[PDB]
Copies of this chain bind each other. A is one copy, B any other.
Amino acid sequence: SHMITVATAECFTHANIGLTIHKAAAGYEDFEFKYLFSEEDLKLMKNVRVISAMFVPSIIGVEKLLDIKLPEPDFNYKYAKAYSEEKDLEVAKLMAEGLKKKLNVNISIGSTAGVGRGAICILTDNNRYLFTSDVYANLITFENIKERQKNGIEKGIKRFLEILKKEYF
C-alpha cells in the first residue's frame, strides 16, 4: 500500500507542474493554477504525493542526476543551447524514464522546449503520454517564450489530472 507518488524534471516549465501538483496535493487554498482543478480533483489529489520537483536547465546536470545520456543539442551556443521539437520530445521522454527509474514513483513528468512547441512527457505505471505545447516559440530569438511556458504548465497539469483519474481511480 502507498500513495500515488509523482516526480518531475522540468526545464521550460520551471518545476511549476510539480510545484502545482504538490500544492494541490498538500491542500493549499491559494495557488496560481488552482482554477485547473475541480472540487472533486482536489479531493482525489489528497491521495497524491510529490517526491521531487526539479528545475533542470543543464544537460550535464540532468545526465548526472538521472544517469541518462541526452542527444547533442541542435543549437549549441551559450545564449542559445536548444533542441529542435523532435529532440525535445525525445529528451522529455528520456528524462521521464530516468526519473521513474531513479525514484520508483508511480508517475514521472519530463518537460523541455527549445525551438518549436516544446515537449512534456507523463509516464505512468501503465502508459506514456507524450505531447507538445500548443504554442510555437523560439528559445534562441526569445519569441513567444512566455506564452509557451504558461501554456505548457496549463496543458501539462490538465493532462496529468485526466491521466491520474483514468488510470488510478
Contacts and interface: CB of A to CB of B under 8 A. Distances in A.
11 contacts: A15-B19, A15-B53, A51-B57, A51-B58, A51-B60, A52-B54, A52-B56, A54-B54, A60-B103, A64-B102, A65-B102
- Complex copy number for this chain: 2
Chain A interface mostly: mixed
A14 B20 CA distance: 11
Most buried by B among A14, A15, A49, A50: A15
Interface string A76-97: 0000000000000000000000
Nearest to A7: B61
B50 A53 contact: no
B19 A61 contact: no
A51 B9 CA distance: 12
A118 to B, nearest CB: 17
Greatest chain B CB density within 10 A among A18, A22, A50, A55 is at A55
